[PDB]
Structure formats: structure tokens, C-alpha cells
Design a protein around this ligand. Structure first.
Ligand SMILES: [Hg+2]
Ligand SMILES: [Hg+2]
Ligand SMILES: [Hg+2]
Ligand SMILES: [Hg+2]
Ligand SMILES: [Hg+2]
Ligand SMILES: [Hg+2]
Ligand SMILES: [Hg+2]
Ligand SMILES: [Hg+2]
Ligand SMILES: [Hg+2]
Ligand SMILES: [Hg+2]
Ligand SMILES: [Hg+2]
Ligand SMILES: [Hg+2]
Lengths: 285, 285
């Protein structure tokens, strides 16, 4: 199949293909949101939290409708932490997003070191409580998994303590699967893709990174993401990353090999990720 | 403080001064695209692949260390017959030219990963493992640089589990993050500062050390086409461009700056780095 045919597909057909070929697990932190907010909304009159939440919901809905089973979205990571508290509480208390979870049969989970890192206040305790109640409440949903990262950047010590307790309880060391279940709440084998933004970087999906995880970096802030963009990414992941057969270099004509060869010898300094800063902003070249 | 051209133009000593100052302290650099490189640059039946490859590996590691990078992490083998990989592995601990390299450039060499369990239980496999151990003892008096070779170093969860259980049993309490990193790698490093990849946008095999601050790069040409210029464009980007200050003040921008940004982000198709194209059976970013 070609790209245009994929783009032209009905949503249901696309979704069938994604449930078939993957990605089963997409990591998608919503990035560049401040820039987005300053370009698309009115900063002193519009509320940043609510505008952001609406965009988040639009995109999570788009991802789940395209057949992606699990989305991992880092929310907060290593100015006042109390400010982040409100935005967080929205994820468990906003009526529209609750309506969304129920309608799309989404199971919501939270991962990371938040219980210890969040402030020891009535407020922080309240958010943590919201998280537990939301994960319990949506646990009967079976169609999609949504995993919110809150201080979910480094799981080493968490995994150490979990493994120690596990050994004392069950008499033996936990498996990789059991470790992943202990950290995330449920099991998934790996991340199939990470959709990043701006400066080429990935973060906050511990235990799940692999050389098979397809990496993408949008130029525009995450909230500009359309169906067509998402589908170009999906098309690359499904049809282009594991393209077969592997190149038989020995079956190529001398002109083919020469084209490749002279290209690599002429510009051996072409590096994706090397950018340029203009007007205070980094742009990939 | 500097433009790209000025950086490219600096004497090696000055570049190394800057790198010791601003980082990267730790670069992850798997040598990738080596089959393509070898078929483009060499004559498959008449040139020896092991030594052509080894020669390039040494050139690049030497280049990296001379530019002031303290620690290089290089994934070697990662999840055809495993016995085939054994020879290439043994070269890293037995080839006289590379041992001479470790000596002249004062490199401490370490091996990480699940290799002791995953390598074949044969005289050959055990010989390779023992040579890894002995190389690490033999170079442990070198202090100027750290070189870490990954052999099945793709997934550290169960290794960390067992390590932590054992640690708690003996060394009295749960091991700290630092202690876990030391247990897995042999020594301590805070994080990876950059990853230099190739072709399809992907990273792999540096467990425990990935951060949102890890700068990501992907060369178009196979690793062995790397020159000083390539390396330095990478270094310039990492050092001067990724952490550029001040942060953009969108509210201080003219209507034209916002308009340009805005119409760039609104325009379709929008550039997604990582979405490639396959021509002649090969993926191109
Ligand atoms: Hg503002
Ligand atoms: Hg769905
Ligand atoms: Hg679930
Ligand atoms: Hg749950
Ligand atoms: Hg998850
Ligand atoms: Hg248990
Ligand atoms: Hg621009
Ligand atoms: Hg060949
Ligand atoms: Hg050096
Ligand atoms: Hg050392
Ligand atoms: Hg290391
Ligand atoms: Hg081409």
C-alpha cells in the first residue's frame, strides 16, 4: 500500500490496520504548549489550563480512534509545583475528560514518583486521592489504556525497592513483566513509538524503551497535530520502518552504489538533530 | 559565546577545553550502518571486514576522546548465529592495536549487559567473557577516559532486580540510584548527555542513563563516515543551541514573528522529523 492510499482510508480501516500491525503503545507528551498558547489563544484573557486540556482531549481521542491501544503521556517531570497541581487535578475531575474516559472505555493509570515528590499538603494529598479514585473507577474499561506520567522519569530506586519487597513476599525475584506491572500498574512489552517535539529528545517512559521504538519529532507544537500528520507518522511506522527485504547491496548496480557512496562522501556532515537558533527559538535542520 | 564556524575553526585543545567545561561528559555512540559502509567503501571478498571495521572504530573513539569527551558508551551487540558475533567481540579485548589504543589514550574499558548469561556456554564464549573481565582489570589504572561496551545491554530491569535483592541482603539496605548504576556498568555516571544514532530514528542500549536532557542525533551516512566536522556540528548544537537562553518571550515578539511561526505551524503538510521514505529498499529521513 502507498502513503496516499493510507491517508485516503476510512478511519475504521486505518484502525483495523493499527490494531493489526501496531503501534500498540504510543508515547506522546504534549509539548510546546506555551508557544502554541501564545500563537493560537489570547494569553491574558484565555485560561491556559482549560485550553490545553481541550487540546489534550482532542488528540487523545484522535489517537484512540485510530486504533492505538495504549497511550503513554508524560504530564509532569523533573516556579511552583502547586501551580502544576491544578492542571493535574483536572485529569481526574474535569467533567468533559471523565465523560471522555467513560465514552471511549479508557482505563487510566498513573506512573512515577508522585506520591513522594508531590507536596505534603491537603492539596497534594487530594490530587493523589483523585488519581487513585480515577484509576479504580476506570478499571472496568477494557478498550484503551491511558497512562499519565507524574515524576515518571527515573525508575531505578522504585524498581529496587519493588524487587526487594517482591523477593521477600514471593520467595524469588520478579520477572521483567512483573517489574513493569509494579511500576505502571499493568503490562505492555515496549513502546512502539514516541512522538516528540522541537529539540530531538525523549523522556519519561522507563523500562519500555527499545531500538524498535520508532522516534518522531514534530516541528510544530503538539497541539497543531492533525489527523493527516498522525497518519503520516503511522504510515512510516507500519510500512517504512520494518521494510522488507533488507537491502541486498550486492544486488545493486554500480550506479546505485555510486550514488549512495558519493552522497555519503560529499556530505558526511548531514546530521538530523543539528539545529539552528533564530529569534530565540531552536529549529531542526 | 561563539558561532558554528568559529567553533569548527578552533584548535583541538580549545574545543576539548570547551567540552570538558560544558559537556558532554557522556556520549552514547553505537557504530551503525557498518554493512552498508563496508559494501560502499570496500571490496567484500578481498578486504577484511573485521579489521576495516575495527580500524574505523578506533579512529572514531580516538576522535571522540581527543575532543574532550570523558565517557563513551558504545553498544556492540544487541537483541544468524551468535557464534559469528563472538569473533568481533573478542577483538575488542585482544586486538593488539586496540589494546595499544587503550594504553596510549589512557582508557578504562568496561562491559555492560546480559552477556555472561546470553553468550553461548562454550569454551569460546567463556573465553570471550573472561577476556572482557581481564580487560577491565588490566585497564583499571587508566583514568583519563572511560569506554563502555554494551553486549546485550538493552534491558536492565531483571539485572537491577537481582542486584538490589542481593544488595539489600548484604550491603544492608536498598542500593541508591548511584549504586545501581555502578552495579550495572561497573562505575558511575549521572546520565548520558547525547546519543548519536543513524538512519531510522531510534535509540537503544544505555539503560538507566536516558534523560530528557539527553540530546539526540541521527546521522544520514553510516557511522564510519564521521569526520571532525560532523562531530563538531553535533558538539556545537549540543553545547550552544539545545540550552539556549533566554527562553523565547512570545509577548515581546512582533506581529510578524508570531505570524511567521503561526503560519509555519498551520501549514500542511507539516514537517515531522522521523517520517522517512523508502527508495531502492532503503529508508531515508
Ligand atoms: Hg504570556
Ligand atoms: Hg478505540
Ligand atoms: Hg486496563
Ligand atoms: Hg486500574
Ligand atoms: Hg502504561
Ligand atoms: Hg507481589
Ligand atoms: Hg524561523
Ligand atoms: Hg556482501
Ligand atoms: Hg583526552
Ligand atoms: Hg575508570
Ligand atoms: Hg559507562
Ligand atoms: Hg536516495
Amino acid at each position: 500500500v502507498s502513503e496516499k492510499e493510507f491517508l485516503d482510508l476510512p478511519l475504521v480501516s486505518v484502525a483495523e490496520i493499527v490494531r493489526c500491525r501496531g503501534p500498540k503503545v504510543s508515547v506522546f507528551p504534549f509539548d510546546g504548549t506555551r508557544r502554541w498558547f501564545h500563537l493560537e489563544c489570547n494569553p491574558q484573557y484565555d485560561d491556559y489550563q482549560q485550553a490545553a486540556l481541550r487540546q489534550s482531549i482532542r488528540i487523545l481521542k484522535m489517537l484512540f480512534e485510530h486504533g492505538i491501544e495504549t497511550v503513554i503521556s508524560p504530564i509532569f517531570s523533573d516556579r511552583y509545583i502547586v501551580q502544576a497541581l491544578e492542571g493535574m487535578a483536572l485529569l481526574a475531575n474535569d467533567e468533559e475528560i471523565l465523560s471522555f474516559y467513560k465514552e471511549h472505555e479508557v482505563h487510566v493509570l498513573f506512573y512515577g514518583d508522585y506520591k513522594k515528590r508531590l507536596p505534603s499538603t491537603a492539596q497534594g494529598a487530594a490530587v493523589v486521592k483523585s488519581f487513585d479514585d480515577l484509576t479504580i473507577s476506570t478499571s472496568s474499561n477494557t478498550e484503551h489504556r491511558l497512562c499519565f506520567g507524574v515524576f515518571g522519569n527515573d525508575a531505578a530506586e522504585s524498581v529496587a525497592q519493588f524487587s526487594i519487597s517482591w523477593n521477600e513476599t514471593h520467595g524469588k525475584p520478579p520477572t521483567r513483566r512483573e517489574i513493569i506491572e509494579g511500576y505502571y500498574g499493568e503490562y505492555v512489552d515496549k513502546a512502539d513509538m514516541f512522538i516528540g517535539f522541537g529539540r530531538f529528545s525523549t523522556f519519561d517512559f522507563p523500562l519500555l524503551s527499545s531500538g524498535k521504538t520508532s522516534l518522531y519529532f514534530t516541528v510544530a507544537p503538539s497541539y497543531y497535530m492533525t489527523e493527516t500528520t498522525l497518519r503520516r507518522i503511522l504510515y512510516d511506522h507500519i510500512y517504512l520502518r520494518h521494510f522488507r527485504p533488507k537491502p541486498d547491496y550486492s544486488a545493486m548496480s554500480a550506479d546505485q552504489l555510486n550514488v549512495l557512496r558519493n552522497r555519503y562522501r560529499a556530505q558526511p556532515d548531514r546530521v538530523f538533530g543539528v539545529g539552528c537558533v533564530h529569534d530565540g527559538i531552536w529549529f531542526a535542520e
